[PDB]
């Protein structure tokens, strides 16, 4: 292994006879060259002569050689090399030549493989002397965590000041203090509406006159046209609330003209204006003057605005008025003339929807598309139907048909509802086989299903309880012979599921997913990858891959038997919020960003979600870190289960102390250390921590206003390169979790002990809270626009998924409206407490960081993590 | 005299100070026992577990449960007896007051109520009930009324933990999650809403558990979640009699003796203790619990 | 059997020997995901835990089976097991003197010495592993001779050019084995005649009577064994049977006629 | 793409890593100056 | 399989709680010890129904035979080494029995569908067999549903909780219980060997000059029993410790270090010893040790070899009781004899 050859390197270790940078460099590469001759590795002994001949590869070898030599060197020489490296780092304190690389090597071995016994204060002082400010910051953070000192606190404050971290410095100081102790008319109108509230019979007239004078002085002024139109909107709203039906005629046409002029002036952010106009037309589509007003505004308005503001047209594609229907059909015909590739997917969603009026209205769309391109829609439905049958994979139909029947039969024994479930499940077997996998089930497990069918017939014809029990026994039998091998389908092969997808290649349709502004270029599809990966999320979603015309791969996660389109509508809320942060100068300076992935609604029973690339979730991110140390995964849960045999079946108060016992006994800095481990360098860790902090801050506030809850480390997803958080399954929104029976929440956004320990030494009140005030002020700065956005999808019947006739839905939506307005304003708890922005931030922080507010939760939410 | 304790062992067990060893153990490995209560004349044993209140027999040789009664969706918190044992009530996670009877029961009426209560107490007239909620509310109900009740709000939306009531019909003490407590004086002619508050005492600052006071109205002893058992005076100079600490784990609900001078302490420290309040010294210490002990019952 | 263990191979032998009183039993052993068989006389079988392989002895397998035998091994070194098996049977017929030596067995010892088996290679050398060959070519010889003969002929034909083809031809010989008139059945009949006329003029009279004049199963197996004896030594495998066949099995000169038949049928196929 | 050639030591372990780093640094000799200085 | 029923184990628990004659107080504990032989399903069911708690409370009992029986049962209550294969090894024949009884059920249904009423006849003798078969099936899926929630980790936790309550019987009465204790300790050595191997190095290097767990208590109790006042127990404990001695004599690469610290007996390795603790801590997946011992003596380091899991002839001893007479009084107590 190693012969006796260490008698010559002692002089190169301890010399203490040099006083020059060149002499120190000579000593350094002399010891680096001679380090290889005692290396125990076969792949390192032979490279000694090569390193002696050629120098630069020893720089990249400098980690392997040091790791080889350190383990082989003996304990008495360990402190010798310790003092040698300490004196090397202490010498030549003014010019940093190679001591930064020395500290890089020291931290590199300090990652996981038995760090050196160097004092951390000495490490910090070498970093400070050798200008490594970020390494000094990490060392001083470790020193502060070991023991809090005022000198250390001011050292981190100065470090943040030189690194331009004012938020970090302020937060550290606060933590130390808290622990150690025309234009004139517009101006007149806005000041008037600020000093005196609306909803009278005199202020609307005054602001209407002011806006009319401003428009007369500047007839091409966008905010004037928009303000006049919205003033007519509030007048019409109060008239409707009072109800007249005659004073609305004098205001519907000026509002329409102003909205058209503003849209034609801007053509950039016309989302709210377009949806406002559509809501106005849908509310009053029986005014002939409005009909000719919008007819003459056809030429003034473009088609690109409706192209960008497509989705609500498909959402309201059903029309109860003939004139409204004709106008919408003409508009969508113009949309089909101008890049129809952005609406064919919602088009056959409308085709396969459950509204007979929607299919009858869409027959005209089909007929007008036949004269343009039959091949587009034909190939579109051909490639669609296979994806819906593959999203809802073929055993899941009768799997859910057995399960939903089974638990309600255990509940209250509704045999008619059994028959209703089982009537359509047996239709396609006598209709005709279609796919190879369907054949593979047919020739295997058809006889038991048939026998169950005539046993159902016998039960219907005789009402025989014993044969009902026998039928339920064979149902248990088939449930077993499905559910045993259900988790054994780790992959699906398209050649046997649906080979026609492979047969149809060189597809000319547009690639589903994200779209560009206006008319996006057409991107074709080459083929499909027939291999998929199955995810375990109680629904078995799969990983779909598409080979596009560009030679790259477009990959998505496929979800089935769900009307997911709520995530699609929240996607334009993400678009609006990123637009507002881009518009804000402070947010643009802070470089805030939320990356929304492409996601198209494939069907009322299927959809695609964009999987973010080059990233890993927090769920997986802890497994390899734990098994590197070879320590159990659910360690804290097992530790508290050691004395809590009935944790789940338990009352409110006694869970708190066992949870506290688990927290006290269990260390909670795994993510905090693994980000340092996976960091490329100190500045790498700096950019990771910055991105991590402001991403989690902005996303948790957006979830707070959105009502997005039910967040768990499975849907929490870090980015491998940067560290941004990306969530999945946004069905829970508008605080829908507060109404469901299964353990209603008390914490709005999941900010756990793991997050607090991963936070910097400034704590939750530092840069996180400093970003909190900026996010709250920029979100309160756009009060009217967000309300105009959210007013559209309240009363519609396509949202009742997380809160569940027409009057009841309207009342529930209006209660949601007052609840979210109270949530924004801060008067949701106490009527007298009209809390402002910083008081709201403090209240939210304490209410989310309270332990009782997070302990009482469902195990499905995984509350301990 | 007999006393019984239960906890995370899933085994209820009796105790006897004369022999120093446990006498009888009964397995209930289906749920965690929250509370238990022994009948005054030592005939049946009831408990608060999960969605079921069952009646065991003392003199039998560890049989199957003699009686069992369900009807609550959530887990049950406490049970209230009667001195004539004609009406059995329980308090659960729904606030709906139920009533049942011994000796071949039928189905009586059930009362539905919101604000899921925590603890209940029956006035000695055997016709009136006071329940405490975790929002600082007191619900007063009686068999005579059908839907009307009384609302008492000692604190505004604050998690009132529990309460205790005087067997002589004088005092009503509260228990708040912040360690606060209120004492209410209520003189004779108890069949009226005339609970007059007197003072307010901040005994602790952390979470607290049930307060028990003796039939003789001369003491008020509480126990909290900081290894603290503190007894104050309720009729003589209104000051702290005795504090007690030193327990390894946090002390759970406690019980008294007949002479109002001995008190038991059951905690999750795998042990239970019995003390003389006058001498504030260890009198008995029973051990054998492999897990913690949460609930205890005693009568003489 | 589906990746079996020792408890599996218990009734894998017992349940069939208890229903076949004296008629012969076919035992196929297909070990390729299994390490090398033991020279000391052990055969590796899986456990239920899928973590390590446990030995099963030749006595254990033989006692679970009975006296008639037709064994087909497809392992790597199938020759130490034969040398050992001959040693075990001669040691038990030495113990047949039986002073106090009679191990309880389901079938009499007098019918042990007349039960047949095959082997896969010649000694402790390696199997075939190239992508240009089926991984279980031995049982390919012993259950589908015609198709693999056609494919081996295509891969050994010097006239590879001007032909319609890891490279493997997509050749399909039409028809089925049973029908006489179809080319596949015609090739089956011509192969049967060709492999019988070699054996009759090679082996002695009583050996021929014992091999190809008693039962059709052993007849077909030993007829395919001659084609195995032809092809495997071209890929360095010289299998061993229970009676020693003379080395004139592969050198009998009508393999020219086999080549002529293959040439004629493939030219007819490509012309069609 | 790769800022420093030490990042590849993160995902794998310590023991078997030793020949891997040597081999994927010395397969770069194919260029002319290394080929000229090491024959 | 045929004998283990919940009604039987509950009646057994009732009898061991209160039955007068100590013979059944012996044999019920013996029956549970035999039922706990190698059956993780049985261990899970008994743990859930609380027979473990009853058998733990039955350690303290007047007669010593039932105490030795209780230690024998908790000897059998070690969880299982081939557990991940025995669980499948039981799943297979539960599946096969379910399939066979199901096929028999439909065979009998087809037999009863013979279009013949047969009043007061074979059909009337067949309905009771019908729901008897149904009851057997339902029992089968009850056990099948109990199979998947096995939790070997909770099994190990209950075993390590039982060991510490076995420990206070070191100051017991007879040498019988002491011998049963030393064979139980030998079996613990056999199963959890590496903990003993990592603790002996530290203990005897400290004697030359991690510990602190309840395991160190058993390690010290073995040395306590090594100074027994009885004849056979002394060499029995010596043979138990002889496996440990023979193992650390080499421990492959460790023999050199062991010899180096062995020369101190008359008068990097730290990490090497520390690494082996986590290797079983991960496989895991009040505490009054109190270490009191009159150390007036020191351990100076008939069968020739040593099988590490020692035998226990107590079952044969208890079986031999059933050959002495029971309906008639034995020798030396007859109305006239030599001893009389």
Numbering used by the authors:
A (entry chain H): 1217 to 1397, 1716 to 1777, 1813 to 2373, 2414 to 2474
B (entry chain I): 3 to 302
C (entry chain G): 148 to 312, 333 to 439
D (entry chain H): 901 to 939
E (entry chain A): 732 to 940, 959 to 1016, 1069 to 1086, 1095 to 1110, 1132 to 1170
Reproduce passages from the article.
To better understand the molecular regulation of TOROID (dis)assembly, we purified TORC1 from KOG1-TAP ∆tor1 cells grown PDS and acquired a high-resolution TOROID structure by cryo-EM. Using these particles for 3D reconstruction 45 resulted in a 3.87-Å map (FSC = 0.143), which enabled us to build a nearly complete structural model of yeast TORC1 in the TOROID. Moreover, the 3D reconstruction and local resolution estimation showed that the interactions between adjacent TORC1 units along the TOROID helix (intracoil) were more prominent than interactions along the helix z direction (intercoil), consistent with the resolution difference at the intracoil and intercoil interfaces. The overall yeast TORC1 structure extracted from TOROIDs was very similar to its mammalian counterpart (mTORC1). Tor2 in TOROIDs is structurally more like mTOR in nonactivated-state mTORC1 (r.m.s.d.inactive = 3.3 Å) than in Rheb-bound mTORC1 (r.m.s.d.active = 10.4 Å). Indeed, TORC1 in TOROIDs had an even more ‘open’ conformation than nonactivated-state human mTORC1: the HORN region of Tor2 made 10° and 24° outward shifts compared with nonactivated-state and Rheb-bound mTORC1, respectively. The Twix region is situated between α-helices 26 and 29 of Kog1 and interacts with the FRB′ domain of Tor2′ in an adjacent TORC1′ in the TOROID. In this vicinity, the structure displays several prominent molecular interactions leading to a robust TORC1-TORC1′ binding interface that we term the hub of interactions. This hub is centered around Trp2207, which sits between Arg884, Lys885 and Arg888 of Kog1, forming a prominent cation-pi interaction with Arg884 situated near the tip of the Tack α-helix and the base of the Twix region.
